[PDB]
Nucleic acid binder design. Structure first.
Ligand SMILES: [Mg+2]
Length: 530
DNA sequence: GACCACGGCGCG
DNA sequence: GCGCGCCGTGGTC
Protein backbone atom coordinates (compact mmCIF):
# COMPACT_ATOMS: atom_id res chain seq x y z
CA UNK A 1 0.00 0.00 0.00
CA UNK A 2 2.02 2.92 -1.37
CA UNK A 3 0.63 3.62 -4.83
CA UNK A 4 -2.66 5.49 -4.54
CA UNK A 5 -5.28 4.08 -6.91
CA UNK A 6 -8.79 5.51 -7.42
CA UNK A 7 -11.74 3.86 -5.68
CA UNK A 8 -12.89 1.15 -5.77
CA UNK A 9 -10.41 -1.63 -4.88
CA UNK A 10 -10.28 -5.18 -6.32
CA UNK A 11 -12.00 -8.07 -4.53
CA UNK A 12 -10.30 -9.42 -1.42
CA UNK A 13 -8.80 -6.08 -0.42
CA UNK A 14 -8.21 -5.20 3.24
CA UNK A 15 -10.44 -2.39 4.49
CA UNK A 16 -9.65 0.51 6.80
CA UNK A 17 -12.28 2.84 8.26
CA UNK A 18 -12.85 5.56 10.86
CA UNK A 19 -15.96 5.89 13.03
CA UNK A 20 -17.04 9.07 14.80
CA UNK A 21 -17.57 6.91 17.88
CA UNK A 22 -16.86 3.36 19.03
CA UNK A 23 -20.43 2.05 18.81
CA UNK A 24 -21.03 0.99 15.17
CA UNK A 25 -24.83 1.35 15.48
CA UNK A 26 -24.38 4.98 16.57
CA UNK A 27 -21.32 5.90 14.52
CA UNK A 28 -20.96 8.21 11.54
CA UNK A 29 -18.72 6.58 8.94
CA UNK A 30 -16.11 9.33 8.61
CA UNK A 31 -13.77 7.60 6.15
CA UNK A 32 -13.28 4.37 4.21
CA UNK A 33 -10.27 2.86 2.43
CA UNK A 34 -8.80 -0.44 1.25
CA UNK A 35 -5.41 -2.01 0.51
CA UNK A 36 -4.19 -4.81 -1.76
CA UNK A 37 -1.28 -5.57 -4.06
CA UNK A 38 0.86 -2.62 -3.00
CA UNK A 39 -2.01 -0.23 -3.64
CA UNK A 40 -4.22 1.91 -1.42
CA UNK A 41 -7.75 3.04 -2.29
CA UNK A 42 -9.54 5.90 -0.51
CA UNK A 43 -13.31 6.22 -0.83
CA UNK A 44 -14.38 9.69 -2.06
CA UNK A 45 -17.68 9.38 -0.18
CA UNK A 46 -17.66 6.66 2.52
CA UNK A 47 -21.35 5.64 2.63
CA UNK A 48 -21.67 5.30 -1.15
CA UNK A 49 -18.34 3.47 -1.36
CA UNK A 50 -19.59 0.93 1.18
CA UNK A 51 -21.80 -0.54 -1.55
CA UNK A 52 -18.76 -1.57 -3.60
CA UNK A 53 -17.35 -4.05 -1.06
CA UNK A 54 -18.39 -7.70 -1.00
CA UNK A 55 -16.86 -8.48 2.39
CA UNK A 56 -15.42 -6.54 5.33
CA UNK A 57 -11.84 -7.78 5.63
CA UNK A 58 -9.45 -6.28 8.19
CA UNK A 59 -9.15 -4.97 11.75
CA UNK A 60 -12.53 -4.70 13.51
CA UNK A 61 -14.30 -6.21 10.49
CA UNK A 62 -17.46 -7.03 12.50
CA UNK A 63 -17.94 -3.42 13.59
CA UNK A 64 -17.95 -2.35 9.94
CA UNK A 65 -20.43 -5.10 9.08
CA UNK A 66 -22.80 -3.97 11.82
CA UNK A 67 -22.70 -0.47 10.34
CA UNK A 68 -23.27 -1.85 6.84
CA UNK A 69 -26.17 -3.91 8.20
CA UNK A 70 -27.48 -0.71 9.77
CA UNK A 71 -27.69 0.81 6.27
CA UNK A 72 -29.47 -2.19 4.75
CA UNK A 73 -26.31 -3.60 3.16
CA UNK A 74 -25.27 -7.25 3.35
CA UNK A 75 -21.56 -6.96 4.02
CA UNK A 76 -20.35 -9.96 6.06
CA UNK A 77 -17.13 -9.80 8.12
CA UNK A 78 -14.20 -11.89 6.90
CA UNK A 79 -10.60 -12.19 8.06
CA UNK A 80 -9.79 -9.95 11.03
CA UNK A 81 -6.22 -9.86 12.39
CA UNK A 82 -7.62 -9.11 15.89
CA UNK A 83 -9.09 -12.63 15.96
CA UNK A 84 -5.77 -14.17 14.92
CA UNK A 85 -3.87 -12.22 17.57
CA UNK A 86 -6.52 -12.99 20.19
CA UNK A 87 -6.16 -16.73 19.55
CA UNK A 88 -2.36 -16.47 19.81
CA UNK A 89 -2.68 -14.67 23.15
CA UNK A 90 -5.99 -13.45 24.59
CA UNK A 91 -4.26 -10.46 26.20
CA UNK A 92 -4.35 -9.19 22.62
CA UNK A 93 -7.57 -7.22 23.10
CA UNK A 94 -6.97 -3.88 21.33
CA UNK A 95 -5.85 -2.67 17.89
CA UNK A 96 -3.36 -0.31 19.57
CA UNK A 97 -1.57 -3.17 21.30
CA UNK A 98 -1.91 -5.68 18.47
CA UNK A 99 -0.57 -3.15 15.98
CA UNK A 100 2.43 -2.35 18.17
CA UNK A 101 3.09 -6.03 18.79
CA UNK A 102 2.88 -7.37 15.24
CA UNK A 103 4.15 -4.62 12.96
CA UNK A 104 2.47 -1.22 12.80
CA UNK A 105 0.68 1.65 14.49
CA UNK A 106 -3.08 2.10 14.92
CA UNK A 107 -3.75 5.62 13.62
CA UNK A 108 -6.87 7.69 12.93
CA UNK A 109 -6.52 7.60 9.14
CA UNK A 110 -8.59 5.14 7.09
CA UNK A 111 -5.96 4.42 4.43
CA UNK A 112 -3.32 3.68 7.06
CA UNK A 113 -5.72 1.39 8.94
CA UNK A 114 -6.35 -0.45 5.67
CA UNK A 115 -2.63 -0.93 5.02
CA UNK A 116 -2.10 -1.85 8.68
CA UNK A 117 -4.70 -4.59 8.29
CA UNK A 118 -3.07 -6.09 5.21
CA UNK A 119 0.35 -5.98 6.83
CA UNK A 120 -0.76 -7.37 10.19
CA UNK A 121 -2.79 -10.20 8.65
CA UNK A 122 0.29 -11.22 6.66
CA UNK A 123 2.39 -11.33 9.83
CA UNK A 124 -0.14 -12.94 12.16
CA UNK A 125 -1.16 -15.53 9.56
CA UNK A 126 2.51 -16.52 9.57
CA UNK A 127 2.48 -16.97 13.33
CA UNK A 128 -0.54 -19.27 13.04
CA UNK A 129 1.11 -21.45 10.40
CA UNK A 130 1.60 -24.69 12.32
CA UNK A 131 -0.82 -23.91 15.13
CA UNK A 132 -3.34 -26.34 13.71
CA UNK A 133 -5.60 -26.25 16.79
CA UNK A 134 -5.66 -22.45 16.93
CA UNK A 135 -6.08 -22.41 13.16
CA UNK A 136 -9.08 -24.70 13.58
CA UNK A 137 -10.66 -22.37 16.13
CA UNK A 138 -10.14 -19.39 13.82
CA UNK A 139 -11.76 -21.09 10.82
CA UNK A 140 -14.43 -23.17 12.53
CA UNK A 141 -15.33 -20.81 15.39
CA UNK A 142 -14.09 -17.21 15.65
CA UNK A 143 -14.26 -16.04 12.02
CA UNK A 144 -17.70 -17.49 11.26
CA UNK A 145 -18.92 -16.36 14.68
CA UNK A 146 -18.07 -12.75 13.85
CA UNK A 147 -20.76 -12.72 11.14
CA UNK A 148 -23.28 -14.16 13.59
CA UNK A 149 -22.35 -11.45 16.09
CA UNK A 150 -22.78 -8.68 13.51
CA UNK A 151 -26.36 -9.80 12.88
CA UNK A 152 -27.15 -9.96 16.60
CA UNK A 153 -25.84 -6.43 17.12
CA UNK A 154 -27.66 -4.98 14.09
CA UNK A 155 -30.93 -6.64 15.10
CA UNK A 156 -31.18 -5.44 18.70
CA UNK A 157 -33.89 -6.37 21.19
CA UNK A 158 -37.21 -4.63 21.87
CA UNK A 159 -37.70 -2.75 25.14
CA UNK A 160 -40.87 -1.64 26.94
CA UNK A 161 -39.82 1.98 27.42
CA UNK A 162 -43.03 3.39 28.93
CA UNK A 163 -42.96 0.53 31.43
CA UNK A 164 -39.45 1.47 32.57
CA UNK A 165 -40.27 5.19 32.64
CA UNK A 166 -43.12 4.37 35.00
CA UNK A 167 -40.95 2.03 37.08
CA UNK A 168 -38.39 4.79 37.64
CA UNK A 169 -40.97 7.07 39.27
CA UNK A 170 -42.06 4.36 41.71
CA UNK A 171 -38.53 3.37 42.72
CA UNK A 172 -37.49 7.02 43.16
CA UNK A 173 -40.16 7.31 45.85
CA UNK A 174 -38.99 4.19 47.70
CA UNK A 175 -35.39 5.41 47.55
CA UNK A 176 -36.45 8.71 49.13
CA UNK A 177 -38.19 6.76 51.88
CA UNK A 178 -35.01 4.76 52.55
CA UNK A 179 -32.60 7.69 52.40
CA UNK A 180 -34.70 9.89 54.70
CA UNK A 181 -34.80 7.08 57.26
CA UNK A 182 -31.05 6.50 56.99
CA UNK A 183 -30.39 10.19 57.61
CA UNK A 184 -32.56 10.20 60.74
CA UNK A 185 -30.69 7.23 62.19
CA UNK A 186 -27.37 8.79 61.18
CA UNK A 187 -28.61 11.86 63.02
CA UNK A 188 -27.48 13.88 60.02
CA UNK A 189 -27.74 13.87 56.21
CA UNK A 190 -24.76 12.98 54.01
CA UNK A 191 -24.13 11.55 50.54
CA UNK A 192 -25.36 8.00 51.01
CA UNK A 193 -23.88 7.28 47.55
CA UNK A 194 -20.38 8.03 48.86
CA UNK A 195 -18.85 4.95 50.46
CA UNK A 196 -16.18 7.15 52.08
CA UNK A 197 -18.83 9.21 53.87
CA UNK A 198 -20.74 6.03 54.74
CA UNK A 199 -17.58 4.47 56.20
CA UNK A 200 -17.25 7.23 58.79
CA UNK A 201 -20.93 7.25 59.76
CA UNK A 202 -20.96 3.48 60.27
CA UNK A 203 -17.64 2.67 61.94
CA UNK A 204 -16.63 5.98 63.56
CA UNK A 205 -19.86 7.85 64.34
CA UNK A 206 -21.97 4.77 65.10
CA UNK A 207 -19.05 2.71 66.37
CA UNK A 208 -20.14 -0.36 64.44
CA UNK A 209 -17.35 -2.93 64.16
CA UNK A 210 -15.38 -2.67 60.94
CA UNK A 211 -14.66 -6.10 59.47
CA UNK A 212 -12.78 -6.13 56.17
CA UNK A 213 -10.62 -3.70 54.21
CA UNK A 214 -10.80 -2.63 50.57
CA UNK A 215 -8.21 -4.19 48.27
CA UNK A 216 -6.25 -1.24 46.87
CA UNK A 217 -6.48 1.57 49.43
CA UNK A 218 -7.21 -0.41 52.59
CA UNK A 219 -10.20 1.60 53.78
CA UNK A 220 -12.80 -0.08 55.99
CA UNK A 221 -15.18 -1.86 53.62
CA UNK A 222 -18.90 -1.13 53.39
CA UNK A 223 -19.45 -3.94 50.88
CA UNK A 224 -22.67 -5.96 50.99
CA UNK A 225 -20.75 -8.86 52.54
CA UNK A 226 -19.76 -6.60 55.43
CA UNK A 227 -23.20 -5.03 55.81
CA UNK A 228 -24.92 -8.42 55.82
CA UNK A 229 -22.89 -9.42 58.87
CA UNK A 230 -24.11 -6.22 60.57
CA UNK A 231 -27.80 -6.62 59.72
CA UNK A 232 -28.39 -7.16 63.46
CA UNK A 233 -25.97 -4.66 65.00
CA UNK A 234 -28.07 -1.64 63.95
CA UNK A 235 -31.32 -0.85 62.07
CA UNK A 236 -29.46 1.41 59.63
CA UNK A 237 -27.67 -1.54 58.01
CA UNK A 238 -30.83 -3.07 56.54
CA UNK A 239 -31.99 0.28 55.17
CA UNK A 240 -28.61 0.84 53.51
CA UNK A 241 -28.70 -2.61 51.89
CA UNK A 242 -32.19 -1.91 50.54
CA UNK A 243 -30.94 1.51 49.41
CA UNK A 244 -27.93 -0.03 47.63
CA UNK A 245 -30.10 -2.45 45.64
CA UNK A 246 -32.64 0.13 44.47
CA UNK A 247 -30.10 2.81 43.47
CA UNK A 248 -27.86 0.24 41.76
CA UNK A 249 -30.72 -1.06 39.62
CA UNK A 250 -32.28 2.35 39.00
CA UNK A 251 -29.07 4.12 38.01
CA UNK A 252 -27.57 1.24 36.02
CA UNK A 253 -30.61 -0.15 34.19
CA UNK A 254 -34.00 1.52 34.75
CA UNK A 255 -32.92 5.06 33.86
CA UNK A 256 -30.22 4.72 31.17
CA UNK A 257 -31.75 1.93 29.04
CA UNK A 258 -34.83 3.75 27.73
CA UNK A 259 -32.58 6.57 26.45
CA UNK A 260 -30.64 4.14 24.27
CA UNK A 261 -33.46 3.19 21.88
CA UNK A 262 -32.11 3.54 18.34
CA UNK A 263 -34.20 6.00 16.29
CA UNK A 264 -34.11 3.93 13.08
CA UNK A 265 -34.78 0.45 14.50
CA UNK A 266 -36.73 1.34 17.63
CA UNK A 267 -34.73 -1.37 19.42
CA UNK A 268 -31.86 -1.57 21.92
CA UNK A 269 -28.44 -2.50 20.51
CA UNK A 270 -25.56 -4.00 22.47
CA UNK A 271 -22.04 -4.83 21.31
CA UNK A 272 -20.68 -8.36 21.56
CA UNK A 273 -16.95 -7.95 22.03
CA UNK A 274 -15.07 -10.90 20.55
CA UNK A 275 -11.52 -10.23 21.79
CA UNK A 276 -12.08 -8.90 25.31
CA UNK A 277 -11.67 -11.74 27.82
CA UNK A 278 -8.80 -13.93 29.00
CA UNK A 279 -10.85 -17.13 28.78
CA UNK A 280 -12.43 -16.96 25.34
CA UNK A 281 -15.79 -15.68 26.56
CA UNK A 282 -17.63 -12.91 24.77
CA UNK A 283 -18.21 -9.65 26.60
CA UNK A 284 -21.07 -7.20 26.09
CA UNK A 285 -21.11 -3.41 26.34
CA UNK A 286 -22.69 -0.09 25.40
CA UNK A 287 -24.86 -1.19 27.04
CA UNK A 288 -23.95 -4.45 28.77
CA UNK A 289 -26.93 -6.77 28.24
CA UNK A 290 -25.18 -9.78 29.78
CA UNK A 291 -25.81 -8.52 33.32
CA UNK A 292 -29.47 -7.50 33.23
CA UNK A 293 -30.97 -8.14 36.70
CA UNK A 294 -32.84 -11.39 37.43
CA UNK A 295 -32.24 -12.62 40.99
CA UNK A 296 -34.28 -10.21 43.14
CA UNK A 297 -37.96 -9.20 42.78
CA UNK A 298 -37.09 -5.73 41.42
CA UNK A 299 -34.50 -7.25 39.10
CA UNK A 300 -37.26 -9.43 37.73
CA UNK A 301 -39.50 -6.41 37.10
CA UNK A 302 -36.70 -4.95 34.98
CA UNK A 303 -36.18 -8.11 32.94
CA UNK A 304 -39.87 -8.02 32.00
CA UNK A 305 -38.98 -4.87 30.06
CA UNK A 306 -37.21 -6.93 27.38
CA UNK A 307 -40.02 -8.06 25.10
CA UNK A 308 -40.73 -9.73 21.75
CA UNK A 309 -41.64 -7.74 18.65
CA UNK A 310 -45.36 -7.81 17.87
CA UNK A 311 -46.22 -11.09 16.15
CA UNK A 312 -43.20 -12.81 17.69
CA UNK A 313 -42.10 -14.60 20.85
CA UNK A 314 -38.81 -14.78 22.75
CA UNK A 315 -37.18 -18.19 23.06
CA UNK A 316 -34.80 -18.62 26.00
CA UNK A 317 -32.34 -21.52 26.10
CA UNK A 318 -30.01 -22.31 29.01
CA UNK A 319 -27.28 -24.92 29.39
CA UNK A 320 -27.57 -26.75 32.72
CA UNK A 321 -24.35 -26.74 34.77
CA UNK A 322 -22.20 -26.62 31.63
CA UNK A 323 -19.01 -25.87 33.57
CA UNK A 324 -19.50 -28.85 35.89
CA UNK A 325 -20.17 -31.12 32.91
CA UNK A 326 -17.08 -29.76 31.15
CA UNK A 327 -15.00 -30.46 34.26
CA UNK A 328 -16.31 -34.03 34.32
CA UNK A 329 -15.07 -34.41 30.75
CA UNK A 330 -11.68 -32.72 31.18
CA UNK A 331 -10.91 -34.50 34.45
CA UNK A 332 -12.30 -37.89 33.44
CA UNK A 333 -13.58 -38.42 36.97
CA UNK A 334 -15.71 -41.56 36.62
CA UNK A 335 -17.80 -40.75 39.69
CA UNK A 336 -18.79 -37.26 38.51
CA UNK A 337 -19.36 -38.47 34.96
CA UNK A 338 -21.60 -41.11 36.52
CA UNK A 339 -23.76 -38.50 38.26
CA UNK A 340 -24.49 -36.79 34.94
CA UNK A 341 -24.76 -40.02 32.94
CA UNK A 342 -27.73 -41.41 34.87
CA UNK A 343 -29.40 -38.00 35.01
CA UNK A 344 -29.24 -37.26 38.72
CA UNK A 345 -29.79 -33.83 40.30
CA UNK A 346 -26.05 -33.85 41.02
CA UNK A 347 -26.33 -31.52 44.01
CA UNK A 348 -27.90 -34.46 45.86
CA UNK A 349 -26.08 -37.34 44.18
CA UNK A 350 -22.87 -35.54 45.10
CA UNK A 351 -24.17 -34.96 48.63
CA UNK A 352 -23.33 -38.66 48.89
CA UNK A 353 -31.29 -33.40 53.37
CA UNK A 354 -31.76 -29.58 53.39
CA UNK A 355 -28.32 -28.29 54.41
CA UNK A 356 -26.50 -31.09 52.58
CA UNK A 357 -28.22 -30.30 49.26
CA UNK A 358 -27.51 -26.58 49.53
CA UNK A 359 -23.99 -27.28 50.78
CA UNK A 360 -23.30 -29.60 47.86
CA UNK A 361 -24.78 -27.04 45.47
CA UNK A 362 -22.42 -24.24 46.49
CA UNK A 363 -19.33 -26.45 46.74
CA UNK A 364 -20.02 -27.91 43.30
CA UNK A 365 -19.82 -24.37 41.95
CA UNK A 366 -17.01 -23.40 44.32
CA UNK A 367 -14.39 -25.88 43.16
CA UNK A 368 -14.38 -24.08 39.80
CA UNK A 369 -13.10 -20.86 41.37
CA UNK A 370 -11.07 -22.44 44.17
CA UNK A 371 -13.48 -21.30 46.87
CA UNK A 372 -11.54 -21.06 50.13
CA UNK A 373 -12.41 -23.39 52.99
CA UNK A 374 -13.07 -20.12 54.82
CA UNK A 375 -15.80 -18.67 52.59
CA UNK A 376 -17.26 -22.17 52.79
CA UNK A 377 -17.31 -21.98 56.59
CA UNK A 378 -19.00 -18.61 56.10
CA UNK A 379 -21.66 -19.97 53.75
CA UNK A 380 -22.60 -22.91 56.00
CA UNK A 381 -21.98 -21.15 59.33
CA UNK A 382 -19.85 -24.23 60.00
CA UNK A 383 -16.44 -23.92 61.70
CA UNK A 384 -13.30 -23.60 59.57
CA UNK A 385 -12.41 -27.14 60.65
CA UNK A 386 -15.62 -28.76 59.38
CA UNK A 387 -15.80 -26.86 56.09
CA UNK A 388 -12.17 -27.80 55.50
CA UNK A 389 -13.31 -31.40 55.98
CA UNK A 390 -16.06 -31.32 53.35
CA UNK A 391 -13.66 -30.19 50.63
CA UNK A 392 -11.44 -33.17 51.41
CA UNK A 393 -14.48 -35.46 51.25
CA UNK A 394 -15.71 -33.82 48.05
CA UNK A 395 -12.31 -34.53 46.53
CA UNK A 396 -11.99 -38.09 47.86
CA UNK A 397 -15.19 -38.78 45.91
CA UNK A 398 -13.90 -36.97 42.84
CA UNK A 399 -10.12 -37.62 42.91
CA UNK A 400 -9.58 -37.22 39.16
CA UNK A 401 -10.61 -33.57 39.56
CA UNK A 402 -7.83 -32.75 42.02
CA UNK A 403 -5.50 -34.70 39.75
CA UNK A 404 -6.71 -32.60 36.82
CA UNK A 405 -6.37 -29.37 38.80
CA UNK A 406 -2.86 -30.34 39.91
CA UNK A 407 -1.95 -31.58 36.42
CA UNK A 408 -3.29 -28.39 34.86
CA UNK A 409 -1.28 -26.20 37.23
CA UNK A 410 1.92 -28.20 36.80
CA UNK A 411 1.70 -27.92 33.02
CA UNK A 412 0.80 -24.24 33.12
CA UNK A 413 3.91 -23.79 35.24
CA UNK A 414 6.15 -25.48 32.67
CA UNK A 415 4.68 -24.20 29.40
CA UNK A 416 3.55 -20.86 30.81
CA UNK A 417 -0.03 -21.25 29.58
CA UNK A 418 -3.16 -23.40 29.98
CA UNK A 419 -5.65 -24.75 27.42
CA UNK A 420 -9.32 -25.43 26.81
CA UNK A 421 -10.50 -28.69 25.25
CA UNK A 422 -10.02 -27.17 21.80
CA UNK A 423 -6.59 -25.71 22.51
CA UNK A 424 -7.54 -22.09 23.14
CA UNK A 425 -4.80 -20.90 25.47
CA UNK A 426 -4.29 -18.33 28.19
CA UNK A 427 -0.81 -17.35 29.33
CA UNK A 428 -0.47 -17.19 33.11
CA UNK A 429 3.08 -16.31 34.23
CA UNK A 430 2.34 -15.60 37.91
CA UNK A 431 2.12 -19.35 38.55
CA UNK A 432 5.68 -19.16 39.89
CA UNK A 433 5.42 -15.85 41.73
CA UNK A 434 7.20 -15.96 45.09
CA UNK A 435 4.45 -14.09 46.95
CA UNK A 436 1.97 -16.78 47.98
CA UNK A 437 -1.19 -14.68 47.68
CA UNK A 438 -0.23 -13.60 44.16
CA UNK A 439 0.79 -17.10 43.09
CA UNK A 440 -2.37 -18.72 44.44
CA UNK A 441 -4.53 -16.11 42.69
CA UNK A 442 -2.78 -16.91 39.42
CA UNK A 443 -3.46 -20.58 40.13
CA UNK A 444 -7.19 -19.97 40.49
CA UNK A 445 -7.20 -18.07 37.20
CA UNK A 446 -5.19 -20.85 35.59
CA UNK A 447 -7.24 -23.95 36.36
CA UNK A 448 -10.54 -22.11 35.95
CA UNK A 449 -9.63 -21.07 32.40
CA UNK A 450 -9.80 -24.51 30.76
CA UNK A 451 -13.27 -24.91 32.28
CA UNK A 452 -14.75 -21.47 31.61
CA UNK A 453 -13.01 -21.43 28.23
CA UNK A 454 -14.26 -24.83 27.10
CA UNK A 455 -17.81 -23.80 28.02
CA UNK A 456 -17.31 -20.67 25.90
CA UNK A 457 -15.88 -22.65 22.98
CA UNK A 458 -18.92 -24.93 23.09
CA UNK A 459 -21.44 -22.09 23.23
CA UNK A 460 -19.66 -20.25 20.41
CA UNK A 461 -19.60 -23.36 18.25
CA UNK A 462 -23.31 -23.78 19.02
CA UNK A 463 -24.07 -20.23 17.84
CA UNK A 464 -22.15 -20.82 14.62
CA UNK A 465 -24.12 -23.98 13.82
CA UNK A 466 -27.49 -22.66 14.98
CA UNK A 467 -27.50 -19.30 13.18
CA UNK A 468 -27.96 -20.57 9.61
CA UNK A 469 -30.80 -22.82 10.78
CA UNK A 470 -32.59 -19.79 12.25
CA UNK A 471 -32.29 -17.63 9.14
CA UNK A 472 -33.93 -20.36 7.07
CA UNK A 473 -36.77 -20.35 9.62
CA UNK A 474 -37.04 -16.56 9.67
CA UNK A 475 -36.09 -16.43 13.36
CA UNK A 476 -33.38 -14.25 14.92
CA UNK A 477 -30.58 -14.68 17.42
CA UNK A 478 -30.77 -11.76 19.86
CA UNK A 479 -28.51 -12.24 22.89
CA UNK A 480 -25.91 -14.55 24.38
CA UNK A 481 -25.34 -14.64 28.14
CA UNK A 482 -22.32 -16.97 28.42
CA UNK A 483 -24.28 -20.23 28.73
CA UNK A 484 -27.64 -18.90 27.56
CA UNK A 485 -29.18 -17.71 24.30
CA UNK A 486 -32.22 -15.56 23.68
CA UNK A 487 -33.80 -15.95 20.26
CA UNK A 488 -36.81 -14.28 18.68
CA UNK A 489 -39.20 -16.27 16.52
CA UNK A 490 -42.49 -15.67 14.68
CA UNK A 491 -45.33 -17.01 16.83
CA UNK A 492 -46.17 -19.74 14.31
CA UNK A 493 -42.64 -21.17 14.23
CA UNK A 494 -41.67 -20.42 17.85
CA UNK A 495 -42.29 -23.97 19.07
CA UNK A 496 -40.31 -25.51 16.21
CA UNK A 497 -37.46 -23.04 16.68
CA UNK A 498 -37.41 -23.84 20.40
CA UNK A 499 -37.24 -27.54 19.59
CA UNK A 500 -34.50 -27.29 16.96
CA UNK A 501 -32.31 -24.79 18.82
CA UNK A 502 -32.34 -26.98 21.92
CA UNK A 503 -31.17 -29.98 19.88
CA UNK A 504 -28.44 -28.01 18.13
CA UNK A 505 -27.06 -26.81 21.48
CA UNK A 506 -27.19 -30.20 23.21
CA UNK A 507 -25.45 -31.93 20.31
CA UNK A 508 -22.95 -29.20 19.41
CA UNK A 509 -19.99 -31.34 20.46
CA UNK A 510 -20.77 -34.49 22.49
CA UNK A 511 -18.75 -35.01 25.66
CA UNK A 512 -18.28 -37.94 28.04
CA UNK A 513 -21.45 -36.61 29.68
CA UNK A 514 -24.61 -35.30 28.01
CA UNK A 515 -25.32 -31.57 27.75
CA UNK A 516 -28.74 -30.52 29.00
CA UNK A 517 -30.64 -27.41 27.94
CA UNK A 518 -33.80 -25.87 29.34
CA UNK A 519 -35.91 -23.90 26.90
CA UNK A 520 -38.86 -21.61 27.47
CA UNK A 521 -41.06 -19.46 25.26
CA UNK A 522 -42.68 -16.17 26.22
CA UNK A 523 -43.61 -12.59 25.49
CA UNK A 524 -40.78 -11.26 27.67
CA UNK A 525 -37.31 -12.33 28.79
CA UNK A 526 -38.60 -13.32 32.24
CA UNK A 527 -41.70 -15.14 30.97
CA UNK A 528 -39.58 -17.05 28.46
CA UNK A 529 -37.13 -18.33 31.07
CA UNK A 530 -39.76 -20.45 32.82
C1' DG B 1 -16.39 17.74 28.63
C1' DA B 2 -12.94 13.83 29.22
C1' DC B 3 -9.87 10.63 31.69
C1' DC B 4 -8.69 7.58 35.77
C1' DA B 5 -8.70 4.57 39.97
C1' DC B 6 -11.54 2.75 43.27
C1' DG B 7 -15.20 0.48 45.70
C1' DG B 8 -19.07 -1.74 44.78
C1' DC B 9 -22.29 -4.90 42.42
C1' DG B 10 -25.05 -6.57 38.36
C1' DC B 11 -24.82 -11.25 35.47
C1' DG B 12 -22.93 -16.26 33.94
C1' DG C 1 -14.22 -17.22 44.59
C1' DC C 2 -13.35 -17.31 38.12
C1' DG C 3 -14.84 -13.99 33.98
C1' DC C 4 -16.62 -9.45 32.67
C1' DG C 5 -18.82 -3.88 32.30
C1' DC C 6 -21.00 0.21 34.55
C1' DC C 7 -22.42 2.86 38.25
C1' DG C 8 -21.17 7.20 41.47
C1' DT C 9 -17.49 9.09 43.92
C1' DG C 10 -13.33 11.45 44.10
C1' DG C 11 -9.54 13.60 41.60
C1' DT C 12 -7.44 15.51 37.50
C1' DC C 13 -6.98 17.87 33.24
MG1 LIG D 1 -12.41 -2.41 38.83
Amino acid sequence: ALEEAPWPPPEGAFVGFVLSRKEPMWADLLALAAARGGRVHRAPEPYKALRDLKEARGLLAKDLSVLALREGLGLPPGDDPMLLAYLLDPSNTTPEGVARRYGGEWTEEAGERAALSERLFANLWGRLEGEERLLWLYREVERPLSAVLAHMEATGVRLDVAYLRALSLEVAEEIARLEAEVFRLAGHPFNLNSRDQLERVLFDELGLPAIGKTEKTGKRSTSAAVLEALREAHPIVEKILQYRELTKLKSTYIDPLPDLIHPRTGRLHTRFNQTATATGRLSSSDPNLQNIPVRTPLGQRIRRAFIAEEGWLLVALDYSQIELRVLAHLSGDENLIRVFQEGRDIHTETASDPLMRRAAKTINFGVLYGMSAHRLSQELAIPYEEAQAFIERYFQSFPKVRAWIEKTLEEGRRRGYVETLFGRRRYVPDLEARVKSVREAAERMAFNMPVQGTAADLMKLAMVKLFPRLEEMGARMLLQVHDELVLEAPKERAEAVARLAKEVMEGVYPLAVPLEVEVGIGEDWLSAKE
